[PDB]
């Protein structure tokens, strides 16, 4: 059922894919504002001990909602909070209470506003909260990784999490493509190994198919310390993730 699960994920990531370049149609918020929102969402997820999949789902919900709706400057953080609440309800065993999110928003939006925006997000997404994320594909990729290296998985997760910061240029790539690029980049960084043939057969993504995404992720990884938003790097500066964020990105990717 694993291959069928991966096939279903590949089929579903297209339907759940947010509109490419939705920030152009947004009259008030920009890519930098979304990056700040994702930074704050990473900080909240570490504050409440939420899973990485929860943050990935929340980012997907924000992207789809802003693709299908227009949000002003003030309500962007409310949209992010509602998406985080929905992702925690869907994925986490015990979602944080709405009062907890209201508190973490520095008492900006009340409980009623948070619940109303949650209702709006649920209506816009038509209760399609099962969007495949980078984590879901990365786990399946790890299942086809030999040998099981913890640093490889930690660095792949770190790169996938970094890819959530900038919509440009990461919303033009499928979540499977981003996960494959992250896995290959991590494998080359820590182990010096290329894209495995097992994943070549399983996914159909050859090394040259991920080359644009791979180069984009390498550019982001090289400039990760200089990035304005640093929540993910601090989060992956912990023994839980083997401190992969402190690793030096490879200077040249031999492609």
């Amino acid at each position: 059922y694993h291959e069928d699960i991966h096939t279903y994920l590949r089929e579903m990531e297209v339907k759940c894919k947010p509109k490419v370049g939705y920030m152009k149609k947004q009259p008030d918020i920009t890519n930098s504002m979304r990056a700040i929102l994702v930074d704050w969402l990473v900080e909240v997820g570490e504050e409440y001990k939420l899973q990485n999949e929860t943050l990935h789902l929340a980012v997907n919900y924000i992207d789809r909602f802003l693709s299908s709706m227009s949000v002003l400057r003030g309500k962007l953080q409310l949209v992010g909070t509602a998406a985080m609440l929905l992702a925690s309800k869907f994925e986490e065993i015990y979602p944080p209470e709405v009062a907890e999110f209201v508190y973490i928003t520095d008492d900006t939006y009340t409980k009623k506003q948070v619940l109303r925006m949650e209702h709006l997000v649920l209506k816009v997404l038509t209760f399609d909260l099962a969007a495949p994320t980078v984590n879901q594909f990365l786990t399946q990729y790890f299942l086809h990784q030999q040998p099981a290296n913890c640093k490889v998985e930690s660095l792949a997760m770190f790169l996938g999490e970094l890819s959530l910061i900038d919509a440009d240029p990461y919303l033009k790539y499928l979540p499977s493509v981003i996960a494959g690029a992250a896995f290959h980049l991590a494998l080359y960084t820590v182990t010096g190994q290329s894209w495995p043939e097992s994943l070549i057969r399983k996914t159909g993504y050859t090394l040259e198919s991920l080359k644009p995404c791979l180069m984009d992720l390498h550019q982001t990884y090289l400039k990760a310390p200089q990035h304005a938003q640093q929540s993910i790097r601090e989060k992956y500066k912990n023994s839980k993730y083997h401190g992969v964020s402190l690793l030096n990105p490879p200077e040249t990717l031999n492609l």
Partner: peptide
């Protein structure tokens, strides 16, 4: 530092 009012930083 998760407790932030992002409206001020957005502008």
């Amino acid at each position: 530092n998760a407790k932030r009012n992002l409206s001020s930083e957005f502008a």
